[PDB]
């Protein structure tokens, strides 16, 4: 059913024809998934100094 999340095996050389799996997993060395429920901070002219 979920042809999206069918992971490719050996003979399927790193790719299925309708999978969105391998393209997700390349992003966990330069991307992290953020959140809404954080503190609102809106001043781009903020000073990070102590």
């Amino acid at each position: 059913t979920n042809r999206n999340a069918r992971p490719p095996k050996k003979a399927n050389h790193g790719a299925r024809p309708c999978s969105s799996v391998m393209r997700r997993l390349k992003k966990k060395y330069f991307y992290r998934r953020t959140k809404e429920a954080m503190t609102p901070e809106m001043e781009p002219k903020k000073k990070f100094e102590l």
Partner: protein, 143 residues
Amino acid sequence: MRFKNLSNTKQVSFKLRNFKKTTKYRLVFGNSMILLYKNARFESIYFELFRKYIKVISKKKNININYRNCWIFLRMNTPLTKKSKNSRMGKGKGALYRWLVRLPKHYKLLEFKNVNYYRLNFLTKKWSKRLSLPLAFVSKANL
């Protein structure tokens, strides 16, 4: 974005769907430093949580120092817009709710001048556990 008129102008910037950069780290001002070890969106609360604990280290009562301890160079770069709940796609771009800093791989978050080696290792480990990011601590001694 555009740094010319920050407050006046309304600002938008492209999300960068795969942005990766490495910048060769090296100390300039001081002895020891903390450096990041992964491309990441560095929030502000990632700093303000452990802001006091640096003052307790670098600054103390009844002691005067002429030279400077900390050198920070952090500025905001990414507006991070978003849509509402029941809104279809199209019909334009979303609106703002926050601001962030997109940092590269090897980024000098902090540069220190004669600060207690024993505490910063105790700090950066706790820093990295809240954040779950890889961070490092470096000193001219070990190098």
